[PDB]
Structure formats: C-alpha cells, structure tokens
Design a protein around this ligand. Structure first.
Ligand SMILES: Nc1nc2c(ncn2[C@@H]2O[C@@H]3COP(=O)(O)O[C@H]4[C@@H](O)[C@H](n5cnc6c(=O)[nH]c(N)nc65)O[C@@H]4COP(=O)(O)O[C@H]3[C@H]2O)c(=O)[nH]1
Ligand SMILES: [Mg+2]
Ligand SMILES: [Mg+2]
Lengths: 188, 188
C-alpha cells in the first residue's frame, strides 16, 4: 500500500491544521512569561525533523546530546471528539554548539515517519521494509505540497529532511537544525 | 488512494498499542480515588464509536444529549519523540436513559473516521466523497483484524460500528452504546 500519502494528510488535518494557526501566540506567551529577558529567543516556527531513514528515537537528546530539552510550550486545548479539552504537546529545545547555547526553538520529529518504520515489521502492514525509504520520501513530499496550499502555513513551520551517509557518521543533527535557524535569521 | 488501511495502522501503532495496556490501571485509579463511593461503575473498556457515515461531531453531547461528560480519565504521559511527557487524553461519559444514569464508561469517536470525512473535501486528498463509505468500512475492518492479533488487546476496548437509516432518524446513539455495556455486563 501507499501509506506516506495518507499519513501526511492525517498529519496535517489532525495536527498542523489545528495547531499552526494558534502556534505563534503560544510561543509569544512563553517568551513573555518565562523571561521577556535573557535569551528569550524562542524561534517563531515549528521545526519538524524529517529523518528519511525513518529512524525516530523517543528522546531527542539521544539522537544528539547537543539538543537539550528546555521547557514545554504552553498547552493547547481543543474539544477533539470524542475527547473534551484534548491536550496538544510541543517541546522546546535549545541547541548547543561547542558548549554554547546557539539557539532555542520548538522542535520535534514527525511521528508518521516513526509509525512508517514500525509498520514494516508487521505482516499485515503489508509494505516491505525495503519500501521504507520511498515511503519516507513520499511523505516529506506530500507534506510540502500540502503545506504549499495551506492557508494556515503562513510560514509557521519549517520541514527538515535529511539522510545520513552510509559510509561515515560525521553528521550532527544539532548542526542541521542550527543551519535552518541561522538561515532564517538572515531570511528574517 | 486506499487510506482506511493506513489510518487504522497509524491509529493502532500510535494510540491503541500505547494506551490500552496502561488503560485499565488508569480506570481503577479514577474509580478508587473518586470513590469508592456511589456509582463508581466506570466500565473496564475503551469504547470507540465507529460512525460508518463518517460524521464525527467534536462534542459528543451534541450527537446525543443523553451522552453526558463526567470527568477526564487521569492523564497518561509518554516521551513520544520529539515530544517529552506527551499527554494522552481520554474522556469519561455517563449515558442517560429516561433521565436515569444507565452507565459510565470511557468513550470516544475514532478520529481517523473524522479525518477521512475531511479528506474528501480536498482536491489533492485524492479520494472522492463517494468513496467515504467503503473507506469507512475498510477502516473498522482493518482495526478488527489488527486488534484480533493485538497482544495488547486483552479485551481492553470494544469497537462500535453503526450506520443510521436513510429514511428515519429514530436512532439513539446512547442506546447503541448502552447495548454493548449491558451485553458485556452479561460477561460480568
Ligand atoms: N506533538 C504532537 N503531535 C500530535 C499531537 N496530536 C497529534 N499529533 C500528530 O497528529 C497525528 C495524527 O493525529 P490524529 O489525527 O489526532 O490521530 C491520532 C489519534 O487518532 C490517535 N490519538 C493519538 N493520540 C491521542 C490522544 O492523546 N488522545 C486520543 N483520544 N487519541 C489519540 O492517534 C492517532 C494517530 O496518532 P499519532 O500517531 O500520534 O499521530 C498524530 C501525531 O502525529 C499532539 O498532541 N502533539
Ligand atoms: Mg486531532
Ligand atoms: Mg503517538
């Protein structure tokens, strides 16, 4: 089956569509209340790590020690049937560079990529572990094309797609994330 | 595209697989702390409303006035990358019969059916509004076949699939839900 397509659409409809519009105000609140001082500096976008290899560790610090958990973005509450006042969780990380706090932003993996990885295990899934990669590529794809026409995506988030070279492991996830942050500084 | 399949699998992998094992203990706690007084009576299963017509209202009371929100099942917390301590929300409803509290259980719609309904709107979704029904049927389907081999589903939840007659509107959702409760009471 072609799943990447459906998961991208479920992802947007049940999450991005809902949270992105109310996202920036939530960021602003954290900044005002927590400091309105010192670093503040929480970036204004939702950052979605897109590991093409579909490897998604539950603790972000594990993938890279330089990615440190700061706080949790103030809850969002919504009556998502049948649930009442259903909580939506985002986590705030600060990226370290040579022991220096280089940036602070709302950051997270794309769960759909993780589910994709898990699905290949199951017999009835039924898409081979081989198809994990193309499925991964189709996902980031569909999202871009979805977010392109997203009235909500008034540049509220930035996708971060990456694959780590097979031969060498000199890849720094924090570095990848920092690039986008800095670039958007020159951009913004 | 065939989406019902992927959404059923995402649903189980990212939700049911995770919460069902820890579900009953959460139920016991509400019963124990809140009581052990008066009704208690929270049922021991997760109830998933499966409207084949794919109509999923955000407020459960609206669908049926006799379905009343009681409280919220104690939070579950899990490090769901990239999120840390990601909250999982379930709501407890008590069903009314002729002004009488007939039952109390954890109850909710299947969000995937709601997303299915929303997808048909979009141009790129790729699937006609016509296909909403077969997509709905394939979803409840896949879930049953998924939950059948679910090591986790040690009878922790019961699916409730239903479609409302086209000619007449004498259908009581609370009645449908009560049936399953009583019938399982026969399980005792
Ligand atoms: N950081 C973050 N990301 C979020 C949140 N909610 C949704 N997402 C993203 O939205 C995807 C699909 O959301 P879904 O439509 O709600 O559909 C969900 C929903 O139907 C069910 N589900 C998941 N979590 C909960 C929950 O906490 N409570 C209830 N009642 N159902 C849930 O699992 C389906 C798929 O779950 P997912 O695999 O998790 O995948 C979720 C997840 O990738 C959130 O609160 N925080
Ligand atoms: Mg949702
Ligand atoms: Mg999940």
């Amino acid at each position: 089956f072609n799943v990447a397509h459906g998961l991208a659409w479920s992802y947007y409809i049940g999450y991005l569509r809902l949270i992105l519009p109310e996202l920036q105000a939530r960021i602003r609140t954290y900044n005002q209340h927590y400091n309105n001082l010192l670093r503040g500096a929480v970036s204004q976008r939702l950052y979605i790590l897109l590991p093409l290899d579909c490897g998604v560790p539950d603790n972000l610090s594990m993938a890279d020690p330089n990615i440190r958990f700061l706080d949790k973005l103030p809850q969002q509450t919504a009556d998502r049937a049948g649930i009442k006042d259903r909580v939506y969780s985002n986590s705030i990380y600060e990226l370290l560079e040579n022991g220096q706090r280089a940036g602070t932003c709302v950051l997270e993996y794309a769960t759909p990529l993780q589910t994709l990885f898990a699905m290949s295990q199951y017999s009835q899934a039924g898409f081979s572990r081989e198809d994990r990669l193309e499925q991964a590529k189709l996902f980031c794809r569909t999202l871009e094309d979805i977010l392109a026409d997203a009235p909500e995506s008034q540049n509220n988030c930035r996708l971060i797609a990456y694959q780590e070279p097979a031969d060498d492991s000199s890849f720094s996830l924090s570095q990848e994330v920092l690039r986008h942050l800095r670039q958007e500084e020159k951009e913004e």
